[PDB]
Amino acid sequence: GELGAGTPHEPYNLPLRGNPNKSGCHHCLADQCHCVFFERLLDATFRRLKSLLPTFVSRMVRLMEITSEDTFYDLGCGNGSILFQVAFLTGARCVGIEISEHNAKVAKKAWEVIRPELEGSSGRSMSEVNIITSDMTKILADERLFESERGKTVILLSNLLFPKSLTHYLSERFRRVPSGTRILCFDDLYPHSRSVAAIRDPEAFRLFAMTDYRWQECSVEWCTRDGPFFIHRRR
Template identity: 30%
Template sequence: MNHLRPDIGYIPTALDLVNAMLALANVNSNDILYDLGSGDGRVAIAAAQQCGARGVGIDIDPERIRIAKENAFLAGVSDRVEFRQQNLFECDFSDATVIFLYLLPHLNLKLVPQLFCQLKPGTRIVSHDFDIGNWKPDRTIQMISSEDEESTLYYWVMPEDIPQV
């Protein structure tokens, strides 16, 4: 594994925002959720605990992966989630039914070709705080987290036809 540096620093998402994101995407036990830039694993773990979904976290930082695996074990969901140390721009997430993003706008845009190449129509995408260029979201929600932070949640459903982004 080559030792690449993360493109952004790690900022954990408040748990009430994680819950709002899961609700927005209507995550359920039939879903395979990918969290791209998964940090400590809280999104995939919450999806497994609360919704019965399977979760896959992708992060380039080996320390974040170690912590996420430990957190999954402590939460009792190691059988439903996995964490992979990978460059998210080189990973295969084609089996995803839900994608979660908390990346900067330029990174979201860089992901667009992969999203449209790999994801099936109907796959749900939720992004915390950052849109995806001029791809109009199906829903946008403004909220204030329990940590008193203003956040925007963006929600898209992968269309049959590729929009111009």
């Protein structure tokens, strides 16, 4: 149902439906979804105690082919909302890395209060969610990270406000993750808008299949309008 072709000139884009689906959602292709449920649950949880909204996560789970056999990594997970939604929708093991100690504390406490509610409503046990309080560069400096997962690895990199040096280091490091790994970024790790890119960086194209996307309107906190993001799949 997505429009476009995933190319730089025709990125994949999903227009909002004029009327909500049966779950009240204007975003998802499916006529049933959990976006509003998670909106309300997240808001209630964090009241009891720069972001991607639940509609974005619902679209992402489909785009990145996330399965219960995958391990989902949110690099810069913040309060952990993405981890909670991905675990609920996929059953994958979820790992978040957060450099801010306060944010890691908030994510762990929110997970503790939220997991009982998800398991009570769905009747199913939640997969594991782990929060690592650290700079992601320290963690990813280990070449053995992700290797045992055999490419059953999904990585979210919300790096619009990351310094360019950090994104560049991640672009270098992700060339060496196993085949099959899927990586989502916003400030492109492997700029490929121009046709000469494959001559400038032939290794990046040998190592990745690259797909361009527009995020749906009102799916990101900072913008009501749409914007670009990219999925790179290790060949």
